[PDB]
């Protein structure tokens, strides 16, 4: 139907999100001339110094039938020769699916010495998160195999992928937590990893799932084949951080510790500056994990009552509904922005927390706005250290959440204070 905004794009951009978060990995994609804007997206939002390692066939109208298969063959071979990757993934775009060209057989015909990963995914009924999750599944299935475990306790960080909302500071904070309690990180994937790291993946004892949108399937595959349990908790907020600490300590079998000295959110919310902060209604829309964690920290730590919760991940509809039943409301799972427009008009909240769509609709509605979700623009990716997880994650969360509210309070106070035409002559008529 008619579409003007999409929270999630084609699965292939998520697949190459995993690809570019990966290192030494080259995605050969059967795409038309013009499906090259995802590289622009990465070098703009992620500000990558290296071009996204994704090759494109970019076929033409003349190149059709017998010519396009040889074009894909050529793309694979010159990509391998030019970049010398240690492994290749092959996939198809929306148009490439329509033409009966099999990427798997074309890649097999080359017989490249490096392993070739066959990525198969429908391009219409799925979304980018499907691309990311299935790509992680394919690389985990192929490159990773069960083997002996490291003597000392180590964990593996799955979920942080490129073009993800605040993932670079995220992995740093989480690694800081694990090393503070003594657990080392054997490998972090897809960010900052190698195919050798994917091979060593199973050497850890237990696993950690930061972003279920991109790692839940890989976590399950590790649980079954690699025999590695993964955590069910995502440490966003103080309480979630403590629960995550306890769970990872139990899995590792070590003494749980935490660095609460860095943490300042509970005191900064117990001050009177957060007394007016009680009673504010917050609308939450975004990705499932972020929305649920934000609602939890808002209800307990932030002094908020949730007025509306929603998401765009049909896969995560069940956990979101289960959580929202606890808050008393009902889930709003959809990808259309007219729906959230109508919902924000009906509820009329005082604060809205969501992706760029929520930010701008709040700007239109004259409501304070904040960003917590994945679909963002260049300004929302910071050079500073702005993690969303851990105790520092809690402090960042408090600061960025109250910033629109204190801005609105200041402007409203100034507007009311120098109010024009102060007569009220009815006083003593």
């Amino acid at each position: 139907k008619l579409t003007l905004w999409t929270y999630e794009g084609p699965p292939h951009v998520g697949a190459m999100r995993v690809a570019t978060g990966m290192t030494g990995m080259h995605y050969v994609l059967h795409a038309p001339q013009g499906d090259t804007y995802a590289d622009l997206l990465f070098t703009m939002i992620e500000r990558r110094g290296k071009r996204p390692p994704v090759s494109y066939t970019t076929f033409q109208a003349r190149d059709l039938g017998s010519d396009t298969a040889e074009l894909f063959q050529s793309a694979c071979r010159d990509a391998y020769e030019r970049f010398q990757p240690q492994a290749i993934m092959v996939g198809s775009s929306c148009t490439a699916e329509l033409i009966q060209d099999d990427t798997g057989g074309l890649a097999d015909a080359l017989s490249l010495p490096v392993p070739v990963v066959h990525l198969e995914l429908p391009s219409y009924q799925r979304k980018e998160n499907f691309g990311a999750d299935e790509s992680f599944l394919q690389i985990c299935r192929k490159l990773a195999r069960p083997m002996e475990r490291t003597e000392k306790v180590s964990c593996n960080l799955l979920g942080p992928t490129a073009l993800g909302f605040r993932h670079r500071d995220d992995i740093l904070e989480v690694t800081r937590l694990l090393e503070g309690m003594g657990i080392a990180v054997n490998a972090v994937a897809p960010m900052g990893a190698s195919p050798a790291d994917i091979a060593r993946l199973g050497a850890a004892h237990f696993n950690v799932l930061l972003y279920p949108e991109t790692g839940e399937s890989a976590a399950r595959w590790a649980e079954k084949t690699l025999k590695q349990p993964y955590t069910k908790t995502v440490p966003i907020g103080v309480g979630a951080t403590r629960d995550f600490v306890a769970e990872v300590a139990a899995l590792a079998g070590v003494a749980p510790v935490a660095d609460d000295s860095r943490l300042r959110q509970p005191w900064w919310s117990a001050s009177v500056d957060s007394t007016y902060l009680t009673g504010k209604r917050v609308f939450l829309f975004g990705d499932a994990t972020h929305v649920i964690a934000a609602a939890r920290v808002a209800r307990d730590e932030m002094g908020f009552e949730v007025v509306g919760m929603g998401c765009y991940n049909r896969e995560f509809a069940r956990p979101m509904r289960a959580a929202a039943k606890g808050y008393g409301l009902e889930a709003l799972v959809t990808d259309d922005y007219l729906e959230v427009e109508e919902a924000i008009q009906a509820l009329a909240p005082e604060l809205i927390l969501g992706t760029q769509m929520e930010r701008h609709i709040a700007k239109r509605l004259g409501i304070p706005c904040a960003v917590i979700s994945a679909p963002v623009h260049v300004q929302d990716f910071p050079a500073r250290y702005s993690p969303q997880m851990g105790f520092e994650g809690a402090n960042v969360l408090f600061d960025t959440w109250i910033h629109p509210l204190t801005m609105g309070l200041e402007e409203h106070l100034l507007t009311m204070f120098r109010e024009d035409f102060e007569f009220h002559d009815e006083a003593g008529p």
Binding site: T6, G34, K50, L98, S123, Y124
Partner: protein
């Protein structure tokens, strides 16, 4: 010959939506093309623009007539939310051409039950067939045949010109002595100009090859002249127009003497920062030859290689004739080999795609993103200094930062 980095023809839709306030653009692309136009001009989408995508489900691919009826119902629904639209555009996406959906007869049957105010035009924005501003060219060529026939001698200004630049152009043309200043990309459908045997047109943007061919089919005759990039190129254009309408050289000089000095001073005011820099080109929007000839002759730059998507020799001729013999033209773009040639040349400034903009900077190459000049007004006399500053911007920052 190999991997190309261009943007499929829907990237024009963003500026055609601004050019015609009356025109709405329904794309029939997948989530890929919808994502292209969504992760594009983000500010536009937050300001209720006039373009959208009709993503087709799985059952809509095998069932051609089902997709046809779906699109028809979308056209009928559109008027409910926007009663201002009077002409409509079913642009062609790559999946649509692959599934062989015929949007021509779709436009015919849609205009059949929409009369007399609403009519819908069909043209292709498919990257397999069009490339970047070639979609603009195809859109204008699509609206050309529907223009009425006339006997009046009219000068046609074809090209998606910015409004203020168009006002300067029409003012200069009127004070020159050339009366008709009609523009094919009219702001509203009521301002659409008629084309007849004595129609004479001048090409503003180089990439309007299909429009030039179409008006040639109708009977309109082209003014072969350099494109309006810098003081001298604009002077040559206005001379050619004066000759085609028989306007005297004396009144032309009287008109063009005043802004010429200001334009040359504005160009020189940014020439110093850019002075003595080798500039490499990559095929982006087919405006590279005219921009190169201006840069070289007026600003004094030694171009290394000029790269364009494709060259239309007939319309672009005078710019190449004014262009220096040093630079070598390039047809097609294999971005790997083009990048290797860039490294070999070691140019001071490289106009290239934004996907290559950051990686080129990482290697230490100053990069200029070529998509300013299509969007930001750089045409004619007033904006010559602006265009010069556009190229002087990156080199100055590169000098200031490092070291």
């Amino acid at each position: 010959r190999g991997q190309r980095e261009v943007f499929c023809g829907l990237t024009g839709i963003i500026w055609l939506h601004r050019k015609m306030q009356d025109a709405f653009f329904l794309v029939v692309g997948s989530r890929t093309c919808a994502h292209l136009l969504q992760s594009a001009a983000g500010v536009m989408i937050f300001a209720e623009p006039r373009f959208g995508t009709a993503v087709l489900e799985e059952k809509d691919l095998a069932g051609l007539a089902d997709a046809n009826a779906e699109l028809d119902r979308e056209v009928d629904r559109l008027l409910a939310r926007r009663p201002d639209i009077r002409q409509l555009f079913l642009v062609g996406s790559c999946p649509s051409e692959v599934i062989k959906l015929d949007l021509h007869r779709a436009a015919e049957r849609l205009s059949a039950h929409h009369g007399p105010a609403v009519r819908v035009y069909n043209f292709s924005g498919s990257g397999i067939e069009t490339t970047f501003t070639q979609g603009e060219d195809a859109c204008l060529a699509s609206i050309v045949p529907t223009l009425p026939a006339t006997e009046a001698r009219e000068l046609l200004l074809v090209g998606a010109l910015p409004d203020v630049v168009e006002d300067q152009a029409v003012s200069l043309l009127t004070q020159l002595g050339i009366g008709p200043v009609r523009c094919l990309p009219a702001h509203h459908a009521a301002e659409a100009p008629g084309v007849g045997p004595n129609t004479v047109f001048a090409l503003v943007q180089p990439f309007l090859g299909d429009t030039h061919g179409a008006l040639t089919r109708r009977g309109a005759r082209h003014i072969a002249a350099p494109f309006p990039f810098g003081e001298e190129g604009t002077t040559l254009w206005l001379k050619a127009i004066a000759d085609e309408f028989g306007v005297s050289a004396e009144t032309f000089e009287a008109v063009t003497a005043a802004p010429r000095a200001r334009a040359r001073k504005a160009v020189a005011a940014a020439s110093e920062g850019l002075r003595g820099k080798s500039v490499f080109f990559l095929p982006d929007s087919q405006l590279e030859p005219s921009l190169a000839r201006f840069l070289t002759r007026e600003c004094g730059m030694s171009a290394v290689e000029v790269g364009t998507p494709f060259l239309h020799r007939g319309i672009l001729g005078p710019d190449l004739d004014l262009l220096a013999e040093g630079p070598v033209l390039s047809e097609g773009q294999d971005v790997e080999r083009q990048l290797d040639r860039v490294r070999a040349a070691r140019p001071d400034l490289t106009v290239c795609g934004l996907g290559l903009a950051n990686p080129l900077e990482a290697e230490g190459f100053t990069t200029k993103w070529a998509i300013e000049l299509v969007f930001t007004p750089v045409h004619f006399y007033e904006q010559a200094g602006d265009l010069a500053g556009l190229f002087s911007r990156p080199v100055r920052r590169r000098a200031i930062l490092r070291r």
